[PDB]
Amino acid sequence: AYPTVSEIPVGEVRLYQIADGVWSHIATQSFDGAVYPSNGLIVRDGDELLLIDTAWGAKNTAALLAEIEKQIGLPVTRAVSTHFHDDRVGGVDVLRAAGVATYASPSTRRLAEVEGNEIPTHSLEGLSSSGDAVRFGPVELFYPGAAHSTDNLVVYVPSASVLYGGCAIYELSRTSAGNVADADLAEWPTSIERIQQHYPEAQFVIPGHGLPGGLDLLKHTTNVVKAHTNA
Numbered sequence: 554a555y556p557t558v559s560e561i562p563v564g565e566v567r568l569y570q571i572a573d574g575v576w577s578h579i580a581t582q583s584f585d586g587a588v589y590p591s592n593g594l595i596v597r598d599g600d601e602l603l604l605i606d607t608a609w610g611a612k613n614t615a616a617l618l619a620e621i622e623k624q625i626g627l628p629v630t631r632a633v634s635t636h637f638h639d640d641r642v643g644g645v646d647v648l649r650a651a652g653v654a655t656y657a658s659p660s661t662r663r664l665a666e667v668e669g670n671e672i673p674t675h676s677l678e679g680l681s682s683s684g685d686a687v688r689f690g691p692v693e694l695f696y697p698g699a700a701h702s703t704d705n706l707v708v709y710v711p712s713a714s715v716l717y718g719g720c721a722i723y724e725l726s727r728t729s730a731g732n733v734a735d736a737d738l739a740e741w742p743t744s745i746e747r748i749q750q751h752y753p754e755a756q757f758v759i760p761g762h763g764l765p766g767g768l769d770l771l772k773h774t775t776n777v778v779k780a781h782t783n784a
């Protein structure tokens with residue numbers, strides 16, 4: 554069973570195998586007096602790991618490199634951050650100290666820089682317009698347009714039919730919207746449209762927080778987003 558916020562102390566990381574060669578990683582952090590779970594992804598590429606997103610924090614990110622070593626024993630060589638918030642780029646520095654090459658669209662690198670977060674080293678050319686898609690290691694990086702943020706990328710894994718939303722995709726259990734400071738809620742439902750078109754074979758969808766399910770999360774996410782905006 555997938556882990557939830559109550560089962561994981563701040564500073565510890567769990568790994569959940571979605572598929573052969575494919576894992577989420579789940580951490581917890583204390584943010585605005587509250588305690589939140591958080592997802593990211595790990596994809597096997599040869600004798601090598603691609604890491605999608607930090608574990609939200611330097612401490613949590615060292616911990617995730619350690620659980621990866623213990624449970625998988627392959628080296629993390631690159632990381633992609635799927636937008637500029639601290640739950641996606643915080644720990645980037647631990648990853649770079651460790652030899653990981655860190656990536657992000659240049660939207661992200663800039664926004665990260667303004668907010669004063671940690672900045673991935675390398676730019677992902679090729680995504681600066683909706684529906685754009687590019688291959689990066691064994692996944693496709695797809696840019697759906699503004700949603701959660703102006704820069705959110707989602708990640709698809711064709712080998713396994715695994716779609717990863719980042720925070721642009723809400724878990725099914727979610728009733729209400731999250732951080733909307735940097736969102737554009739009018740397009741968000743159409744960006745989820747583009748996703749739906751590109752990736753209709755997706756057998757697994759992994760929200761940026763909470764439990765994975767199928768492509769129902771997509772409509773469910775748009776449901777949630779519309780409620781918020783009609784209130």
Ligand SMILES: C=C(C[C@H]1O[B-](O)(O)c2ccc(Oc3ccc(OC)cc3)cc21)C(=O)O
Binds near residue numbers: 720
């Ligand atoms: C679950 C969440 C909130 C949690 O997830 B998240 O990716 O928006 C996120 C981003 C950054 C977070 O740290 C900050 C948030 C706002 C801020 O501005 C002052 C400064 C730091 C916390 C979260 C969600 O679904 O949006």
Ligand SMILES: [Zn+2]
Binds near residue numbers: 640720762
């Ligand atoms: Zn988030």
